[PDB]
Design a protein around this ligand. Sequence first.
Ligand SMILES: *[C@@H]1O[C@H](CO)[C@@H](O[C@@H]2O[C@H](CO)[C@@H](O[C@@H]3O[C@H](CO)[C@@H](O)[C@H](O)[C@@H]3O)[C@H](O)[C@H]2NC(C)=O)[C@H](O)[C@H]1NC(C)=O
Ligand SMILES: *[C@@H]1O[C@H](CO)[C@@H](O[C@@H]2O[C@H](CO)[C@@H](O[C@@H]3O[C@H](CO)[C@@H](O)[C@H](O)[C@@H]3O)[C@H](O)[C@H]2NC(C)=O)[C@H](O)[C@H]1NC(C)=O
Ligand SMILES: *[C@@H]1O[C@H](CO)[C@@H](O[C@@H]2O[C@H](CO)[C@@H](O[C@@H]3O[C@H](CO)[C@@H](O)[C@H](O)[C@@H]3O)[C@H](O)[C@H]2NC(C)=O)[C@H](O)[C@H]1NC(C)=O
Ligand SMILES: *[C@@H]1O[C@H](CO)[C@@H](O[C@@H]2O[C@H](CO)[C@@H](O)[C@H](O)[C@H]2NC(C)=O)[C@H](O)[C@H]1NC(C)=O
Ligand SMILES: *[C@@H]1O[C@H](CO)[C@@H](O)[C@H](O)[C@H]1NC(C)=O
Lengths: 116, 194, 232
Amino acid sequence: QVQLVESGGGLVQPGESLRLSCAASGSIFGIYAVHWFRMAPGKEREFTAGFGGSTNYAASVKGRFTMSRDNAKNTTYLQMNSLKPADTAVYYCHALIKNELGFLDYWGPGTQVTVS
Amino acid sequence: LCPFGEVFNATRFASVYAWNRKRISNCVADYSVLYNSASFSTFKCYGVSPTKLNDLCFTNVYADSFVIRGDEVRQIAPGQTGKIADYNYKLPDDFTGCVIAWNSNNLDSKVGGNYNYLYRLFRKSNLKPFERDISTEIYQAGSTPCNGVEGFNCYFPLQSYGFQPTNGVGYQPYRVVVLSFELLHAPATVCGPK
Amino acid sequence: CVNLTAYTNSFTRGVYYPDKVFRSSVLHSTQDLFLPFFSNVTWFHDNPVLPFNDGVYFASTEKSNIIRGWIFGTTLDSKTQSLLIVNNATNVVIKVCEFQFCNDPFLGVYYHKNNKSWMESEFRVYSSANNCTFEYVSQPFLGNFKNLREFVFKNIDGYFKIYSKHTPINLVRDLPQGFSALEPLVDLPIGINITRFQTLLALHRAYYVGYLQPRTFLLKYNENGTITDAVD
Ligand SMILES: *[C@@H]1O[C@H](CO)[C@@H](O[C@@H]2O[C@H](CO)[C@@H](O[C@@H]3O[C@H](CO)[C@@H](O)[C@H](O)[C@@H]3O)[C@H](O)[C@H]2NC(C)=O)[C@H](O)[C@H]1NC(C)=O
Ligand SMILES: *[C@@H]1O[C@H](CO)[C@@H](O[C@@H]2O[C@H](CO)[C@@H](O[C@@H]3O[C@H](CO)[C@@H](O)[C@H](O)[C@@H]3O)[C@H](O)[C@H]2NC(C)=O)[C@H](O)[C@H]1NC(C)=O
Ligand SMILES: *[C@@H]1O[C@H](CO)[C@@H](O[C@@H]2O[C@H](CO)[C@@H](O[C@@H]3O[C@H](CO)[C@@H](O)[C@H](O)[C@@H]3O)[C@H](O)[C@H]2NC(C)=O)[C@H](O)[C@H]1NC(C)=O
Ligand SMILES: *[C@@H]1O[C@H](CO)[C@@H](O[C@@H]2O[C@H](CO)[C@@H](O)[C@H](O)[C@H]2NC(C)=O)[C@H](O)[C@H]1NC(C)=O
Ligand SMILES: *[C@@H]1O[C@H](CO)[C@@H](O)[C@H](O)[C@H]1NC(C)=O
């Protein structure tokens, strides 16, 4: 039973740099992929950052986005820089992990960051 | 008696794009639960007759659990060119496996919507039978590729299930487990209850 | 894995029981892979991988227990499925997996940091486990070295047969004159292609070997059922 805890999410001004840490509380056999998704006002279910194998990010923010996959501490890091009001979003975690109970996909509760 | 029931009683099933495979062996298999209907929907069980299953002996059984909308439950069948087959989960052309589908709209659906599950509808090529595809690589409906998954040029293959409670039976989500059966020179693990 | 830097005149040994159903006082003949009388088979005690030619006989004369199991695989490469028999006093487990074994076979044992409890959990047998097809939990089975543990492995027809027996004799002499009646312990339906075999032991960080030969032998059964006499 993997539990995803999001940390580092806070309301910030445009142009700021923020990190979201999605710590995996439950024990794991191994990780395949973990993907960030955005709920932004006027924006649907969309792919923030993840892989695609090699690390992949979204359009117009690929340089701003930075993925730090850590297989030792079991916490993934997302760095978004030069923030804009369009980046006001709930960043939902989604980790595809095979663990003790079994292969599963787990969705993080997500954190909302407001930019204006 | 290996736990064929636990998959029926698992807390939550796998997504469409990523299907978890459990193989059961060195155990006696009971089809009594399958003699009873999974839900109001009668399961389609290919190959050998459902009433004859207790006599069958399989070298290995592979169980896959996933949740799908009621409309696409008919789509899953041995070897048909379909969206789930081409991009989500492919079954060989002529297969004897047994499909069990039971409605779970009440438990699964959320008023706010549970997007725990996605499907793939986009791919340049065809899906071989029984290979789980977790690739998130950029897809291009248009001919020209783009870097950075630009919207109007490149369209993401994965899209989520809303699972808002809907009266339409096609949208209602069913929990479905498929039982792949294979035979080879090795002795069959499956045994009859009596 | 931390890599580290004889035959006796063999008569009347390990004839296994062929059938489980009860029989009494009759002279029966069956032609099957058997160890010949006076076969002069080899004795082991410093453990190379030995090719599995036919079914294999095996013996343990020592009173103390150091044997930790065996290793069964066609090659050291992972690709070939491997039968890891596990004989640990805590747990005896038949685990069949696509195993990439380490260069040195011995497992490792050590005591606890603060409790100094001698833990044998650490393994140094296989480097990797690629595809693990099977798991079984069986019954955990065990100065003149009185006891004799005698075993036969037979892998044919997708069936792997374990013929086991034990009997103490106070004689220190390596090979007793008296007959050895052997009972089947376990059967495995894995049927994995096995061309070679090795032992398995632990490391701090007496072993007859014969091959079954096709020949018919005569057995006289007791009223109780034991093999009182076996002859050519
Ligand atoms: C010698 O070292 C330890 C001594 O205890 C053995 O570890 C045991 O190994 C078995 C089989 O790998 C495992 O037990 C299993 O536990 C699971 C739950 O995790 C459950 O499905 C079963 O109860 C199953 O037996 C476990 O790792 C461990 N068990 C215990 C009680 O310690 C080890 O296997 C022995 N052999 C070797 C070669 O190391
Ligand atoms: C025994 O284990 C080996 C492990 O290498 C299996 O070989 C490959 O295992 C990978 C596991 O991720 C699988 O390949 C994956 O999917 C496709 C297959 O074409 C491809 O995108 C990548 O190769 C990807 O890694 C697949 O199970 C298998 N692939 C091939 C070409 O053999 C092997 O299948 C296992 N044998 C069994 C389970 O009998
Ligand atoms: C074949 O063997 C069976 C083994 O169960 C015989 O049954 C009886 O087994 C008990 C258990 O050991 C014997 O008790 C012992 O008898 C000896 C000899 O008198 C005595 O010294 C011991 O203190 C203990 O009491 C019992 O004697 C034995 N039955 C008889 C009639 O001796 C079974 O009878 C055997 N069948 C034959 C006659 O081949
Ligand atoms: C597991 O889930 C099923 C889903 O309904 C529960 O009910 C069983 O449904 C199957 C459908 O084929 C029947 O064959 C069984 O007879 C049903 N079991 C009953 C009515 O007790 C089932 O109870 C669940 N099991 C557990 C242990 O929770
Ligand atoms: C077992 O492996 C050996 C070694 O390659 C090979 O010669 C033999 O044909 C194999 N037999 C089976 C049944 O796989």
